[PDB]
Amino acid sequence: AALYTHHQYIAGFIMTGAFAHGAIFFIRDYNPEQNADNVLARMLEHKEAIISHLSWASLFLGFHTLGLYVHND
Amino acid sequence: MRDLKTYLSVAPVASTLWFAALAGLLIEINRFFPDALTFPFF
Amino acid sequence: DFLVHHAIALGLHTTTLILVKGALDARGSKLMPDKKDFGYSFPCDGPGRGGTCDISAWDAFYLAVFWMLNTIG
Amino acid sequence: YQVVQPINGDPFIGSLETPVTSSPLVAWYLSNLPGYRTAVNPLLRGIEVGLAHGFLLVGPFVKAGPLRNTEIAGQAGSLAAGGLVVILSICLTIYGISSFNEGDPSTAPSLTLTGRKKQPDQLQTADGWAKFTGGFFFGGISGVTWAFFLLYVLDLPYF
Amino acid sequence: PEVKILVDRDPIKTSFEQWAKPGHFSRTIAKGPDTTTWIWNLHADAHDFDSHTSDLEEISRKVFSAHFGQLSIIFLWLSGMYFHGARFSNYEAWLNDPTHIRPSAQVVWPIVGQEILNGDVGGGFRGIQITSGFFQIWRASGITSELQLYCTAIGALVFAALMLFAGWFHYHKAAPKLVWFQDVESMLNHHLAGLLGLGSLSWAGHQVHVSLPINQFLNAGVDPKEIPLPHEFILNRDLLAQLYPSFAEGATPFFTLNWSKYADFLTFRGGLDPLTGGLWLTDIAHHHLAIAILFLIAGHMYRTNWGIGHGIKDILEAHKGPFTGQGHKGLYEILTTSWHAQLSINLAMLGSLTIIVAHHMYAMPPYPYLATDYGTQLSLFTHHMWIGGFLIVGAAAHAAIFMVRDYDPTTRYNDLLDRVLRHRDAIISHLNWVCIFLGFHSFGLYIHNDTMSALGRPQDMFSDTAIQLQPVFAQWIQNTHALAPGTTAPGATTSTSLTWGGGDLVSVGGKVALLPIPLGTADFLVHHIHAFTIHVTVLILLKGVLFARSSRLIPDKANLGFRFPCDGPGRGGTCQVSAWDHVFLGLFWMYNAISVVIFHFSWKMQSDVWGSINDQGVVTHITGGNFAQSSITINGWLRDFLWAQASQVIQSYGSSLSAYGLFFLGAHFVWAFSLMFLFSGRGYWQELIESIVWAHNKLKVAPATQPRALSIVQGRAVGVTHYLLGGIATTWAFFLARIIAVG
Amino acid sequence: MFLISWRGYWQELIETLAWAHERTPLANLIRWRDKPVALSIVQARLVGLVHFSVGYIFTYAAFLIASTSGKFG
Amino acid sequence: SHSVKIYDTCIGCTQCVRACPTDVLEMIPWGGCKAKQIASAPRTEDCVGCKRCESACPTDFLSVRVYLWHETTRSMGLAY
Amino acid sequence: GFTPPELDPNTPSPIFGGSTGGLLRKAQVEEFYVITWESPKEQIFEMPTGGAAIMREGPNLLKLARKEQCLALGTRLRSKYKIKYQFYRVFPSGEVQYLHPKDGVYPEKVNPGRQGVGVNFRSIGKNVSPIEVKFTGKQPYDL
Ligand code: CLA
Ligand code: CLA
Ligand code: CLA
Ligand code: CLA
Ligand code: CLA
Ligand code: CLA
Ligand SMILES: CC1=C(/C=C/C(C)=C/C=CC(/C)=C/C=C/C=C(C)/C=C/C=C(C)/C=C/C2=C(C)CCCC2(C)C)C(C)(C)CCC1
Ligand SMILES: CC1=C(C/C=C(\C)CCC[C@H](C)CCC[C@H](C)CCCC(C)C)C(=O)c2ccccc2C1=O
Ligand SMILES: CC1=C(C/C=C(\C)CCC[C@H](C)CCC[C@H](C)CCCC(C)C)C(=O)c2ccccc2C1=O
Ligand code: SF4
């Protein structure tokens, strides 16, 4: 039990750090002109669809999971 | 009368009336067919 | 197991939402189009334009850590 | 008649004159303490302060310590008081080293309450503070030793 | 100079024009909504009359009419109470056998399987047990049948209608003028005498005629339906003469000053009634008579129209000494032109009064069969404690509002307030030191005990068996109280309360009503904890009030207003510098303090007071006196209080108390939900709403009213509201389930 | 604490504390060398998150190890 | 000392100058708009970083930008 | 070009009963500020640090510990009482530095004798990204 909890918490921290450093790269080391129209720039330019659909997925999951739990309770 | 109608359709009042009607409808449906966990008609 | 796995999915999706939103909007958004010039971490942009608390990408990571802890929990 | 007044009549300095702050007996008592004996060698003021504090510290350590019930209560408490005096000496020495330099004058105010010149207190110099802290360490060790000797080593009914 | 009735005719004509326009009061709001933020503002400033206008007369008229509306609401609430007791209650069954039947005055229709909540409460009835204590009030008033309850409900409904009409008429037909509101001497004279004194005399008159003879018959064992009606005791006087002979002479003792002859029903016994477990009604009637005399005299102090009396201005300006300059000069003008000053004073006083009411009400129970109704006692104490705490925090809120808005030394200058504002730094610094010192010594001792226990050194703990911290002063005071009757207060037979001492345990129906409460080391520690929490919350509120206008950080804080988010990230950061934010933090600290107080009360009562008596007189307490030895460590509070007593609530599923478990979990949820608002900022939420709004724009389904994220101050307000609701509700469910299952 | 209460309150409190220390006998002989200030906004968020995480981890580790080891099964 | 910049979109409305609580900004002669005015920041050493100036600028995006930088005793707004 | 007025000691200070919000050690070792105005008549005003003070007839001089305090006091004197004011910065060496209004006319009104400082001739959206100024001491906005 100790080992499993250990490695899961460390993995969560590592994932959160990976995303943090991705954001840091966007801020510091990103060159818009040298990345013109490649996958990275196109990711940046339709960020809103990504964020909105991910928000929809989160809303669906939360709504229905909590609804079922509260119903059973 | 006209202003009574106007205020009676404002967001809060309209929403409360709509939700009271919906609650009553659902309550009656549950009362007639309670403890329904599946759709058996077809 | 079904219900708890869907809770896990909710946690993963919401943490990813916070982190992805913090990253893709790090370079700037409609509320602060010149964010890239203010660095990765900064307090805010003052109370103007409605108020700009927790507008940095560092603050997005900050809010994502809570969700990571919750999901791993 | 009003009791509270602005400092020295200057109402734009952040302070007030009050019976607690500035009453004849209180002013005399405060001026007659070692910390405020400006024209005295810092070593002797440190000696007085250390004696008082070292003698002070013995009581609480001895009575309330983990070995109060044990027969060695006096020894343990006296050793703890001595150790605390040593740590306070360390703190004084590092504070003096960090806050003072040999080549700089005293940072103490040079003016008195009537506006006349006076030699700034040498305690706020580097060597002045060094002498004061050495005197404090010596006096603290002596005070701890005296308080320990006064009890336990000698009966002397108290309480 | 003279006191007279002044009004204005038809100031506002009743109509529906302004109903159709949302937010008529504010011009920009009247124009219409541009963004969703508008909507929130419309509610945030609904009752902020002093901001919609600047005329004192309009503000006063609005305040008077809103008072009438709230009074109507209260009357409607009381009418609902009495009607529910009349129809949907087992009041008569409970009246026949009080200790046997559990009071209940609410049933639930059977719709979705919720009829499980209609539990077996006794008396051939199924419903939801009520802890409001209404049954005891009705029994003490002499109500025996449901016809009387029906009549009271109808009368209360009629009075609610009358209050509503009075509000309408006074705001729209006859609105008093400003000089009428500013007449405080006559107002004080009437409220002291016309309201309090006269009302107490009226209630004493009722108790002499209805409460006493009816409760005497009830305690004699007569069935409630066989008792003569309350009016008979007035028609034929021998009915009263039988119970108390001194009614035979009738009034002549009162006019010949042979008042001793009235000793039959006007006593000074003290203590509790051994049969019902409440205060002697013959003591309460005498209480209200004496109170009526005192208030009718006190309401003759201030001068109105006939020269005799006191001018409040004269009293105020006659007081001043060498330490305060010309103090009290100018306060009369401050307190008669600003409503927020009066509101803050009155809120502080009412909060303190409610707290005192809780203390005195569990100290000596005043209603029959209330002491042994443990659920009622606990619920009443906790409810009054929370109400008082909230009112006290509101006092600070409105003091700060006055300081920001209505304080003006150019026109209304006061000396004491000026001196306070001039040495606020010293005040707050010393208060901060006191807070730190109390926090270290109160909580630090708990941490010390916990650490010693963890290290296997119980001899070093601060306990009754290791290092004792006995509250000698409290013990001495309660000992002096125990010896009081017959020594220092000869006319009293029993001490004021049974918590003082003297033994004489009082029990009813096999349950302990009251007995002496011992004070030990744990009591000392918890009392110092209470002092620490009260001092810290006072620090927060006082610092908010004093530094509302200016400080060394923002020298022009008043120009920003009472409510505002910040002053930017300059000077290192100026987050939460406004007084509203100080109230916002004071709310959290008040919650902390009141939670600890109610926890102490509950555990102490269960451990050392409440319990079951037996044939030999052996008291078995709900908790076997573990408070003295377990409450001195945090681990004991977590284990012997929270963990042990949460079993009742968590198990409630499958029974009539399942609603309490549901509310327990839901309160936990809402509390955790509040942290969402308390920890984040609105910038992130606005940025996310941008993507959401874009997703909506893609489908031509975007709202015209642009959806903005909540304002900073609104985020704080929502966070604190949800935090308080969740915490208070989880404690409510915990207490109710525990005391209903175990009581 | 650091997550709910924010900087301005603490800054004003520290200001009055500095006044008090500077205005008292025998202790004004001791002078600080770095002017006391309230924690920065970003720093306060970081400290609050660190406290949150450390408490989270420590309490869960204690619970898990004690409950599994208490039964050893 | 914080860095305050004025950008050429400024319309010389003067609202930022009215707002500064340390007298950091000014109005100077200029020729690219109707007012012949533009904001200047000659005394940024006294800027406290309140960003009250930005809250007053009506242009979109802002014409006056405050970039918080190295902190001094003047920028930290300390009276002790 | 507008010789700044010289600070004149001996000018009376406003009537004040003392406060705990006054000067501290920073005034003693670093700097403090002085504000002067005229006030046609004696009247009571709100101090920027504590309670209420009374302005003497004729010139008034008040010493504050912060420039922001001086500006708040000047704003209140200018908008409420319609009084002209000027304040200085005083160093422990004995130096005085005229501060405001710097060129005799308040900064709100455009003056033909002012040069532009920190003005960028471009919209805020035309700043280079950080990557272009990386490993150079400059910042993207300083360009
Ligand atoms: C119990 C605590 C709690 C809860 C319930 C939530 C819930 C949520 N968070 Mg949150 N969060 C929390 C704590 C919590 N958080 C804390 C402590 C932090 C650290 C600051 C965060 C930081 C955070 C961030 C940064 C974000 C979220 C987001 C979200 C939402 C994700 C979408 C979703 O799951 O669909 C719905 C989930 C639900 C649980 C449904 C809630 C509504 C139910 C159905 C009740 C309906 C009302 C009901 C009719 C009763 C009304 C009563 C009447 C009086 C009005 C969700 C509503 C993300 C978001 O906004 O999504 C886009 C987001 O970005 N959270
Ligand atoms: C991390 C290392 C550490 C160590 C090795 C100790 C060791 C000790 N602690 Mg301490 N403690 C620590 C951390 C530590 N503590 C921390 C972090 C805290 C804060 C929570 C405390 C809080 C604490 C309290 C409140 C008390 C102790 C006490 C004690 C002593 C109890 C046993 C005893 O009676 O011995 C022998 C008892 C004696 C009285 C002899 C005194 C010890 C020697 C002889 C003193 C000589 C000092 C010497 C001059 C060097 C000065 C320090 C120098 C290295 C800089 C023991 C020597 C108890 C005590 O004894 O009081 C002092 C006690 O009251 N501890
Ligand atoms: C009975 C008919 C009637 C009519 C047609 C009007 C019409 C009007 N009144 Mg008026 N008033 C009335 C009765 C009436 N009033 C009564 C009985 C009172 C005594 C309380 C008042 C006291 C009063 C005041 C003090 C004021 C007005 C004002 C006004 C005008 C502004 C819009 C308005 O009414 O507010 C909005 C309409 C509402 C229905 C708001 C709701 C208010 C009720 C009381 C809420 C109920 C509380 C509820 C139980 C809370 C619990 C919540 C829970 C249900 C979830 C408008 C022309 C205002 C004005 O003239 O501005 C200059 C003004 O300040 N009225
Ligand atoms: C404020 C809370 C508090 C208090 C009152 C105590 C008190 C005590 N602890 Mg303790 N402790 C605490 C918190 C506290 N602890 C915490 C949080 C921890 C960490 C978990 C510990 C861990 C700990 C350990 C391990 C031990 C103790 C021990 C002790 C006892 C002896 C300690 C000692 O001699 O130190 C020194 C005492 C002094 C130097 C006295 C200074 C204070 C003076 C008397 C007051 C000065 C004010 C004065 C009146 C002002 C007037 C001015 C005027 C003259 C001008 C003592 C009764 C020891 C013990 O054996 O317990 C019996 C022990 O070993 N504690
Ligand atoms: C015998 C004289 C008398 C009495 C009994 C009262 C009683 C009351 N006044 Mg009042 N007042 C009086 C004289 C009196 N006043 C005078 C002379 C003035 C002018 C200086 C005022 C000015 C005044 C103001 C400005 C306010 C009150 C308010 C209140 C109520 C306070 C809340 C409360 O405790 O509710 C207790 C509830 C009851 C006792 C229930 C029964 C209520 C009865 C019917 C009240 C009838 C008394 C009334 C004065 C009768 C005259 C009207 C007549 C033409 C029908 C209370 C009912 C406040 C309020 O509006 O109430 C919310 C308030 O704002 N009074
Ligand atoms: C007789 C007591 C009393 C009175 C007459 C007032 C009157 C006033 N207060 Mg005040 N206040 C009080 C007590 C009182 N207060 C107390 C006890 C506190 C401490 C909590 C406060 C704290 C306070 C603050 C912080 C502020 C005021 C403000 C105001 C003014 C505007 C309030 C308003 O309309 O905003 C709008 C009112 C609302 C939007 C209603 C809020 C709804 C609450 C939060 C929900 C309650 C939940 C419910 C109990 C349970 C859940 C039910 C739900 C699930 C359906 C107004 C003159 C404001 C002001 O600016 O002063 C000028 C302001 O900032 N008050
Ligand atoms: C063999 C096999 C299989 C297969 C599978 C597959 C092939 C899949 C997958 C997979 C996957 C699919 C995975 C994944 C993962 C992911 C992740 C983990 C992510 C992420 C993201 C991130 C991390 C980001 C970062 C960043 C950013 C944010 C931007 C900038 C840059 C950077 C990069 C920094 C299975 C198992 C079925 C079964 C058995 C057999
Ligand atoms: C969630 C959240 C928001 C977003 C808050 C929102 C979006 C308010 C949500 C209110 C409701 C849910 C939306 C409005 C509902 C309408 C009345 C439409 C209802 C129609 C049917 C669904 C009934 C903030 O703005 C914020 C600001 C500062 C700190 C924390 C936070 C924060 O946590
Ligand atoms: C308490 C608090 C303060 C005041 C905090 C202060 C003044 C810190 C004082 C702590 C002292 C220095 C002792 C701390 C002891 C630490 C355990 C030591 C850590 C040092 C190293 C080991 C890292 C803020 O300034 C603040 C600012 C913004 C939001 C919230 C807050 C906030 O909550
Ligand atoms: S941030 Fe504040 S102090 Fe600095 S220039 Fe802008 S308005 Fe002036």
Side-chain angles (χ1 to χ4, degrees), chain D residues 14, chain E residues 425-426 428-430 432 552, chain F residues 10-24 27-28 30-32 34-38, chain G residues 78-80, chain H residues 20 23-26:
Chain E
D425 276 281
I428 294 305
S429 65
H430 294 76
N432 178 307
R552 294 175 179 271
Chain F
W10 296 109
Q11 184 59 74
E12 325 200 272
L13 198 63
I14 292 178
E15 253 149 23
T16 179
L17 285 173
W19 175 95
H21 180 288
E22 183 178 1
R23 293 294 103 184
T24 186
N28 47 24
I30 312 305
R31 313 218 183 68
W32 62 74
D34 301 322
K35 308 191 179 325
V37 294
Chain G
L78 304 196
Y80 55 94
Chain H
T20 56
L23 300 180
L24 282 181
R25 263 265 308 191
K26 184 188 76 96

Side-chain angles (χ1 to χ4, degrees), chain C residues 39-56:
Chain C
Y40 176 56
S41 179
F42 53 94
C44 94
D45 204 31
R49 312 196 299 289
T52 58
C53 298
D54 290 328
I55 197 168
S56 67

Side-chain angles (χ1 to χ4, degrees), chain A residues 15 18-19 21-22 25-26, chain C residues 23:
Chain A
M15 293 285 330
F19 273 102
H21 269 293
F25 149 76
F26 271 149

Side-chain angles (χ1 to χ4, degrees), chain A residues 22-47:
Chain A
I24 291 162
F25 149 76
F26 271 149
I27 286 297
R28 287 188 175 174
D29 302 326
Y30 181 64
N31 196 313
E33 284 79 37
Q34 304 189 6
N35 296 270
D37 221 25
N38 64 1
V39 290
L40 201 52
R42 288 164 85 78
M43 286 296 308
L44 265 184
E45 87 189 23
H46 76 274
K47 52 165 155 171

Side-chain angles (χ1 to χ4, degrees), chain E residues 661-676:
Chain E
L662 284 177
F663 265 84
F664 192 69
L665 281 184
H668 274 77
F669 178 85
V670 169
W671 179 96
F673 183 73
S674 78
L675 308 177
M676 206 210 192

Side-chain angles (χ1 to χ4, degrees), chain E residues 403-479:
Chain E
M403 194 75 21
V404 167
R405 281 183 182 178
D406 308 351
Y407 163 85
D408 192 355
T410 77
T411 59
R412 290 175 250 278
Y413 172 83
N414 185 51
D415 204 328
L416 306 157
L417 190 45
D418 171 70
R419 290 191 175 220
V420 174
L421 285 173
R422 266 160 43 210
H423 70 282
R424 57 189 188 180
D425 276 281
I427 294 170
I428 294 305
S429 65
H430 294 76
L431 187 50
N432 178 307
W433 166 79
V434 171
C435 285
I436 298 181
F437 163 85
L438 273 167
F440 269 122
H441 287 72
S442 90
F443 183 58
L445 286 181
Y446 275 92
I447 294 304
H448 163 106
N449 285 347
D450 222 323
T451 293
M452 278 330 144
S453 180
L455 289 164
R457 300 162 58 185
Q459 63 275 3
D460 298 337
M461 265 183 63
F462 284 98
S463 67
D464 272 315
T465 62
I467 305 176
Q468 321 194 345
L469 295 162
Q470 299 291 336
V472 293
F473 299 116
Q475 294 164 0
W476 182 95
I477 287 180
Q478 84 177 8
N479 188 0

